[PDB]
Design a protein around this ligand. Structure first.
Ligand SMILES: Nc1ccn([C@H]2C[C@H](O)[C@@H](COP(=O)(O)NP(=O)(O)OP(=O)(O)O)O2)c(=O)n1
Ligand SMILES: [Mg+2]
Ligand SMILES: [Mg+2]
Ligand code: NA
Ligand code: NA
Length: 327
DNA sequence: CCCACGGCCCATCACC
DNA sequence: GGTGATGGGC
DNA sequence: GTGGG
């Protein structure tokens, strides 16, 4: 559906969702509003009343009332008021800095720190991640055109094979679903010597090499299985520099890999829909495995999975191209 | 009336 | 020094 | 906030 169908309503709900997460610290209300926004966004008609909306699953009494007020006035008094509130709107804004959550934003605003400028003035109170988030605030809210993702993929797959030609690397996420732009880059990594029944160097080696060729520029977090950091394409000398980008690299056991690829190729909406169907034939699927639910819900042993397809087979669904896993 | 609300790794805090 | 809890991200 | 035991 076109966004201008009910965009006014969904904008309202998303903004409400944001204030619940960031200011009220009510995560389940945040998800409630999002779910409501999502189901309304998929609704193929212009909503004329809150009662009409209430028919949709996830839209209840309170949101129905909010829709009525919005339809009658073009606004929400509560939303209008919290927008004007310096404290609440500053708290809500600072959470856009990667590394600053509802709690940190709260503490900052409590002690007079409300803007990016104030953050820049008080580096002493920021942790490593927050400093990076601050330094690349602008860049991190930029999307990544597919053409750059391709170039980023070229570098990653090249350098990974250079380190060890037995590595397997896959760019997942919205890129693998064929999106024409992405928020970040997700890389899944495996190696024939790393399975469930098993360096910590395997992830480190790759990260280090990507640093050596000046692709990776910063590190947010780095463990033995998960890396989160910043990367940047090289410039053309004449041409102006590319924005810095967020990149995640996950090292996964060889025998948990194609569950990982499925999960982290995702679409959140597809994952939960494929979750949904999986439990209905008595299967539970997470990022690691697919397990048969038992006569009680006895989730037993992981089944063998050597491809994305096997997982589709288990729950009698035909293989869906990542291109179509929007939902 | 009352509880659940897809999950987990890493950095850092709280506390012994 | 350490273990467990919490914040944050995705 | 919504849904359901
Ligand atoms: N908590 C999480 C985090 C990620 N995922 C899955 C679904 C996502 O499509 C996939 C990758 O996560 P993601 O990077 O945050 N989203 P994605 O790459 O699809 O789109 P972008 O907004 O980054 O362009 O992992 C998930 O199912 N639950
Ligand atoms: Mg992504
Ligand atoms: Mg990601
Ligand atoms: Na409803
Ligand atoms: Na943030």
């Amino acid at each position: 559906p076109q966004e201008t169908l009910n965009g006014g309503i969904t904008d309202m709900l998303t903004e409400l969702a944001n204030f619940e997460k960031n200011v009220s610290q009510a995560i389940h209300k945040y998800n409630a509003y999002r779910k409501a926004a999502s189901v309304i966004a998929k609704y193929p008609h212009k909503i004329k009343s809150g009662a009409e909306a209430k028919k949709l699953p996830g839209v209840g009494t309170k949101i129905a009332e909010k829709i009525d007020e919005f339809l009658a006035t073009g606004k929400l008094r509560k939303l209008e008021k919290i927008r004007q509130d310096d404290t609440s709107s500053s708290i809500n804004f600072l959470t856009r800095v990667s590394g600053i959550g509802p709690s940190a934003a709260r503490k900052f605003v409590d002690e007079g720190i409300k803007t990016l400028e104030d953050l820049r003035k008080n580096e002493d109170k920021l942790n490593h991640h927050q400093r990076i988030g601050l330094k690349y605030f602008g860049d991190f809210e930029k999307r990544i055109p597919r053409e750059e993702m391709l170039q980023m993929q070229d570098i990653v797959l090249n350098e990974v094979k250079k380190v060890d030609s037995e590595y397997i690397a896959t760019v997942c996420g919205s890129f693998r679903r064929g999106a024409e732009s992405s928020g970040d880059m997700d890389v899944l990594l495996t190696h024939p010597s790393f399975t469930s029944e098993s360096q910590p160097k395997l992830l480190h080696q790759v990260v280090e090499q990507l640093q050596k060729v000046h692709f990776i520029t910063d590190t947010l977090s780095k463990g033995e299985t998960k890396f989160m950091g910043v990367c940047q394409l090289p410039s053309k000398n004449d041409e102006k520099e590319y924005p810095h980008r967020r990149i995640d690299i996950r090292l996964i056991p060889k025998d948990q890999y194609y569950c990982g690829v499925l999960y982290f190729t995702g679409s959140d909406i597809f994952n939960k829909n494929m979750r949904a169907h999986a439990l209905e034939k008595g299967f539970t699927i997470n990022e690691y495995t697919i397990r048969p639910l038992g006569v009680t819900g006895v989730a037993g042993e992981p089944l063998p999975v050597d491809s994305e397809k096997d997982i589709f087979d288990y729950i009698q669904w035909k293989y869906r191209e990542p291109k179509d896993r929007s939902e």
